[PDB]
Structures are given as C-alpha cells and as structure tokens.
Design an enzyme around this catalytic site. Structure first.
Site, PDB file in Angstrom:
ATOM      1  N   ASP A 262       0.817  -1.251   0.000  1.00 33.62           N
ATOM      2  CA  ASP A 262       0.000   0.000   0.000  1.00 33.62           C
ATOM      3  C   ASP A 262       0.841   1.287   0.000  1.00 33.62           C
ATOM      4  O   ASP A 262       1.867   1.368   0.717  1.00 33.62           O
ATOM      5  CB  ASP A 262      -0.841   0.005   1.272  1.00 33.62           C
ATOM      6  CG  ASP A 262      -1.872   1.133   1.310  1.00 33.62           C
ATOM      7  OD1 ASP A 262      -2.662   1.243   0.361  1.00 33.62           O
ATOM      8  OD2 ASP A 262      -1.935   1.960   2.245  1.00 33.62           O
ATOM      9  N   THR A 264       3.103   3.103  -1.509  1.00 33.38           N
ATOM     10  CA  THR A 264       4.582   3.200  -1.527  1.00 33.38           C
ATOM     11  C   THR A 264       5.182   4.618  -1.593  1.00 33.38           C
ATOM     12  O   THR A 264       6.327   4.774  -1.113  1.00 33.38           O
ATOM     13  CB  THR A 264       5.220   2.262  -2.607  1.00 33.38           C
ATOM     14  OG1 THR A 264       4.556   2.510  -3.867  1.00 33.38           O
ATOM     15  CG2 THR A 264       4.833   0.784  -2.286  1.00 33.38           C
ATOM     16  N   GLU A 295       1.484  -0.179  -4.831  1.00 28.13           N
ATOM     17  CA  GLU A 295       0.413   0.820  -5.094  1.00 28.13           C
ATOM     18  C   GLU A 295       1.075   2.201  -5.084  1.00 28.13           C
ATOM     19  O   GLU A 295       1.309   2.778  -4.012  1.00 28.13           O
ATOM     20  CB  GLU A 295      -0.725   0.788  -4.059  1.00 28.13           C
ATOM     21  CG  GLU A 295      -1.847   1.719  -4.493  1.00 28.13           C
ATOM     22  CD  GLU A 295      -2.403   2.628  -3.395  1.00 28.13           C
ATOM     23  OE1 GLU A 295      -3.413   3.321  -3.670  1.00 28.13           O
ATOM     24  OE2 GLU A 295      -1.848   2.685  -2.275  1.00 28.13           O
TER      25      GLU A 295
END
Ligand SMILES: OC[C@H]1O[C@H](O[C@H]2O[C@H](CO)[C@@H](O)[C@H](O)[C@H]2O)[C@H](O)[C@@H](O)[C@@H]1O
Ligand SMILES: OC[C@H]1O[C@@H](O)[C@H](O)[C@@H](O)[C@@H]1O
Ligand SMILES: OC[C@H]1O[C@@H](O)[C@H](O)[C@@H](O)[C@@H]1O
Ligand SMILES: [Mg+2]
Length: 580
Positions: A262, A264, A295
């Site tokens: 999630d 990044t 993501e």
C-alpha cells in the site's frame, strides 16, 4: 552475497524452541529500566543481552498467552503472531510448523499470468471469515480469475474494518479466523491452482493498538508524519526489519504468493539502500517465486527497474475510463478528459502522466516519468477496486454511478480483460453486484466519534461507524443467478476464457499492441505470429457499424465476442466487439 538480516535464533516476539523445550521470548527496548514477560498470568524477569535486547526461554508451548511488562506496565507484543482478544490483549504463542500443508506441487504464479480478484474477508461472505471465503474458491476458479488479492489482515481495533488501520502487522485479525483457518484458505486456493496475494501497509500503523513506541520511540520519527501518527523511521534498522520480517512471515509461513504494498510513495527513506529495495532482497532470499507489487501514484518506473519490484498498480487507466463513462471532474478526476482518443493514448503510454504538468488544484506539479522501460505485465489496470468504490461518498460501483449504462459497464470489462496489462477485478464486479462498498470502521470511544465526524465534514453520507454501513457492503451471492447480474457474469466468464485460450491474446509485449480512435470508437489491435485481434469499443451515444470505422489497417472479419451477444458487426451505444 546479500545475506538476510533475519535469523530464527534471534527473532523478536515469541518463537517455539526445538526439542519441545518451550518458547523463546525476545524484545528490543531503548528506554525500559525493568523488563518482564507475563506468561499465563505469571511474571518472569527477562535477561538483558545488550543493545536493548531482552530474552527469556520458558517451557511453555504454542497456545500460551503473554504480554511484556515495561517499567511495570503490561504492554502487548508488537511482534505478536495472534491476538485472540484484540490489539489491547495478550498475544498467543504460535507454531508455524504444525499446519499440514498439501501444496507441495504448487509453485507460485507469474505476474503475466495473473488476473487478480480483490477480496475483503469481512464482506465477501455473510460469515466474513476465511473458512467461508474458502468455500467460494471453486466459484472463483470456474469464473477464470487466477490470483486472489486479499485486503489487509494485520490485526486492528474493533469488529470490522477495511484493514488500513492494522496495528499488529504479524497477527492475522481474529474475527476473520485463527492462524490455521488462514493457512487452510491459502492451501485450498493452491490445491485449485489459484495464487493468493496479501495487501500490506508499511507506510503507517493504525491509531489504536500500535505499542512500538512503548518499547522504543526511535521506531518512529518526527521528521514527517503519517495519517495516524509519527512516521515510520526507515533509517532505524529495527524498523526496517519489522517490515521485512513481516513480509517474510506472510510469504514463508502462510504461503502467500506475493504482496501488494500500500501507498509506496509514503514509505520515506533516505538510506543508501531504499527499504523497497531491501524488501525485494529479503523476499527473494526466501528462494521462491514470490511477487511484490507497489500501489504507487508517481508513475515512476524505478519501482520496477531499481527497487526490483514486479509491477505497479497504475490508476491513470482507471481514471481515464471512469471520466469517459461519467464525465465527472471532482478531485483527481480533473486530471483527465476521458474519451476514445484519450483512452487510446493512455493505453499506448501505459500511464498518461510521464512528466507533464498535473493541474489538479492543490496538487499542481510535474507528474510522472517516461514509461518506456516497463512491459505490459508491469502495469496493473482495473476499472474498480476498493478505493475507487469506497472513497466515493455513497460507495457506489461503476454501473451504479449516474449516467453509466450496463452496456458501457460490459464494454469496459471487455477492454480491461483483453489488454496485455495485468488486470484486477473487485469482488462482485463480475455480476454487476447491487451492493455498494462503503467505508466502514469500528473504533472505540473518542477516536470512533472523530472518524464519524471526519467522514461527515469531508463530503446523506453513511456513518462509517454504523453496523449498517458494514452490512450494506456485504456481497449478495444469490442475486448473481438472475437477470442482468447473470448476463454480466456470463460475459465475464466468456472474457476470462478467451483471455486464457486465445493464442493472440496471450501477447504480453507492448511492441505488439497499438491503439487509436475514429470519433468515439476506440480500437485496440494486437498482432503476433499467431494472428491479429482488434477490440472496438463504441464510446458514443449512437450506433456504429464496424465496416464504417475508419482504421489504418484492414479490420479482421471473424466476430469472436460481442458484449451484447449480437450476430452482426454493429455496435450499439457503449458496446464492444473483439474480431480476429
Ligand atoms: O459536455 C460538456 C463536456 O464535454 C466534454 O466532456 C465530455 O466528452 C469527453 C470526451 O471528450 C468525455 O470523456 C466526458 O465524459 C464528457 O463529459 C469536455 O471534456 C468537458 O470539459 C465538457 O464539460
Ligand atoms: O540504542 C542503541 C541503538 O539501538 C540500536 O541497535 C538501533 O538499531 C540503533 O539505531 C540505536 O542507536
Ligand atoms: O490512490 C492515489 C491517488 O492519490 C491522489 O492524491 C493522486 O492525486 C492520484 O494521482 C492517485 O490516484
Ligand atoms: Mg470519423
């Protein structure tokens, strides 16, 4: 010659010892003056090893309940492998050697072979558990998806949530099931030849149940913040190992095939070796075939070519598709014109923004980088996912937005599922599910009241804290058996079968993919040594004959699939056809 920083001997938390000798408990603290473990109600002083490391071995086994006592304060273990009483309670000692895996003949899945199917355990079935989810695997297998993408499982506070408030990253959330129930789900998926991927959140901890600062404030930094607290300090090796140790757990111990990282862009690290690169090193050291996806909204190819991640969730395609179908312009949707000519360009370039000015008010900057280095599988495309449904005030799905027809919805599926990019579907998308996917949570006390107030002010909007908001998001499986739900489901089945079977659609090279438009008709052409395929999508309001579409090549004659099952090469408003 990369050497993992992880040795089971020195693992933080509670690890079963060999020869039935019990459990070794270990922690790191930079500030505690007295340190004890309380096991099954009894305190035991721990041994100081230096470097703030404390250890004790006791003859207790898997199933023992414990927490740590820092300067006399009982404190949950941040390395807890299970938290049966939630994030403020005792941890349970877990032994990963006891589960009887049956998936020795499963060897992972390549990105180029993934069609992801995003599941939220709590809403995917009435029961909202792994066991109930496992019962839908044969359905998913027959549907034609190949990899389930599971929303975050790290324990968070309350009895339901999306997962982004995870606080104990190593402890699967107890309401979904015990550790063995999760293993059972993955083992069942592998027996049917489905991959299983996990969403992990390494940019922030949730607001309730994260006790790492009680052990050492230096896990975190005041240099930057997250949504909920202090930012995660990736200059601190123990912080780095907290997340690399976690990624190795999920892959090695629960047999996940890959992880979806999630948010990044918010994993800030100025170290010589970025934490994303070290994550890739650490998971590869396991000697399997596991994948890492980012993501990331920056349109930055370095995630793949420098950090050595496998692929990137890339929203420009989603956003261009949504604006094409709704015309909406609020927030980041203002970055897109939509339309056939716009979609053709975005597909051509993989992502749209490659360094051009992003003119969205409050966000203005030069966004993105050239996409040339990336190959089709490196881009993960969708027309729906948790965020692009749930971050709308009423959580409505694409076919439920004002001005979207089911024909347009079905055309969008044909575009997504015939492209060589890696597609993702969101649970229930395949039958045009009638239920929304709303933002729900279940925080305690003042924090719960703040979430409710926060949601109201941000945008009647469903109260995220209301039980009803969670129940309204539950999938209704029975509805797929009828009407337009069944029709939509038949089309998804047909598209996923073509994707699997069609020798030209097996293409995974952008070199072989061209796109264009004629007015409101989009065309997407694939040419390989096996043949030629063209997808045409009529994004206009009128009927278009395939014969009258002006194309710079000769259109293929054989009708392979029409999204409304017509016999002739004609496209009603919103309809698509694949020819060959
Ligand atoms: O009708 C007024 C709008 O026309 C355009 O937007 C439409 O056409 C786009 C393709 O050119 C579609 O993607 C979009 O969904 C339609 O709303 C124009 O782009 C808008 O600024 C106008 O308001
Ligand atoms: O407190 C001493 C030290 O604990 C460590 O070993 C941390 O990794 C380090 O960065 C810190 O300086
Ligand atoms: O999910 C990340 C999203 O965050 C937004 O703030 C960005 O403007 C957008 O590019 C992206 O789609
Ligand atoms: Mg024309």
């Amino acid at each position: 010659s990369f050497q993992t920083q992880h040795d089971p001997r020195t693992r933080l938390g509670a690890t079963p010892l060999p020869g039935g000798a019990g459990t070794r408990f270990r922690l790191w603290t930079s500030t505690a003056r007295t340190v004890a473990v309380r096991v099954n109600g009894t305190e035991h002083v721990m041994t100081s090893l230096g470097g703030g490391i404390y250890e004790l071995e006791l003859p207790v086994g898997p199933g023992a309940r414990y927490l740590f006592v820092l300067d006399g304060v009982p404190t949950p273990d941040p390395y807890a492998r299970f938290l049966p009483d939630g994030v403020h309670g005792e941890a349970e000692v877990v032994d990963f050697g006891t589960f009887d895996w049956t998936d020795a003949d499963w060897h992972g899945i390549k990105l180029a072979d993934c069609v992801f199917y995003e599941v939220h355990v709590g809403t995917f079935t009435p029961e909202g558990t792994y066991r109930a989810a496992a019962e839908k695997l044969p359905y998913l297998k027959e549907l034609g998806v190949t990899a389930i993408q599971v929303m975050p499982l790290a324990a968070f506070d309350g009895q339901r949530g999306w997962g982004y408030d995870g606080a104990a990253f190593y402890a699967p959330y107890a309401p979904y099931g015990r550790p063995e129930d999760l293993m059972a789900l993955v083992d069942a998926a592998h027996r049917l030849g489905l991959g299983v991927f996990l969403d992990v959140v390494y940019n922030h901890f949730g607001p309730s149940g994260n006790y790492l600062s009680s052990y050492a404030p230096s896990y975190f930094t005041d240099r930057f913040s997250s949504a909920w607290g202090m930012g995660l300090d990736y200059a601190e090796p123990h912080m780095r190992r907290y997340v690399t140790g976690n990624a190795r757990m999920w892959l090695r111990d629960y047999h996940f095939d890959g992880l979806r990282l999630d948010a990044t862009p918010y994993m800030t690290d100025d170290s010589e070796t970025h934490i994303l690169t070290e994550l890739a090193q650490e998971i590869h050291e396991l000697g399997g075939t596991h994948l890492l996806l980012a993501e990331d909204h920056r349109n930055l190819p370095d995630l793949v070519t420098v950090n050595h991640l496998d692929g990137i969730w890339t929203d420009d395609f989603h956003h261009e598709t949504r604006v094409t179908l709704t015309g909406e312009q609020e927030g980041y949707y203002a970055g897109y014109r939509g339309g056939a000519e716009a979609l053709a360009y975005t597909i051509r370039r993989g992502w749209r923004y490659e360094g051009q000015f992003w003119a969205v008010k409050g966000e203005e900057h030069e966004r993105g980088h050239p996409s040339d280095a990336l190959e089709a599988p490196n881009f993960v495309y969708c027309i729906q996912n948790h965020d692009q449904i749930g971050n709308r005030p009423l959580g409505e799905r694409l076919h439920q937005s004002d001005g979207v027809t089911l024909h347009e919805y079905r055309g969008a599926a044909a575009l997504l599922l015939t492209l060589p990019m890696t597609p993702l579907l969101f649970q229930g998308q395949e039958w045009a599910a009638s239920t929304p996917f709303q933002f729900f949570s279940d925080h305690a006390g003042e924090l719960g009241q703040a979430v409710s107030e926060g949601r109201k002010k941000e945008f009647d909007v469903p109260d995220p804290q209301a039980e009803q908001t969670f129940l309204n998001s539950k999938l209704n499986w029975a509805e797929r058996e009828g009407g337009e739900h069944a029709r939509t489901l038949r089309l998804y089945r047909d598209l996923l079968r073509l994707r699997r079977e069609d020798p030209v659609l097996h293409n995974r090279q952008r070199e072989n993919l061209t796109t264009g438009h004629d007015g409101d008709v989009l065309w997407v052409r694939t040419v390989t040594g096996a043949g030629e395929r063209v997808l045409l999508w009529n994004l206009g309001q009128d009927t278009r004959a395939v014969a009258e579409v002006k194309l710079p090549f000769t259109v293929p004659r054989r009708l392979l699939l029409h999204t409304e099952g017509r016999e002739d090469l004609t496209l009603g408003a919103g309809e698509a056809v694949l020819v060959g």
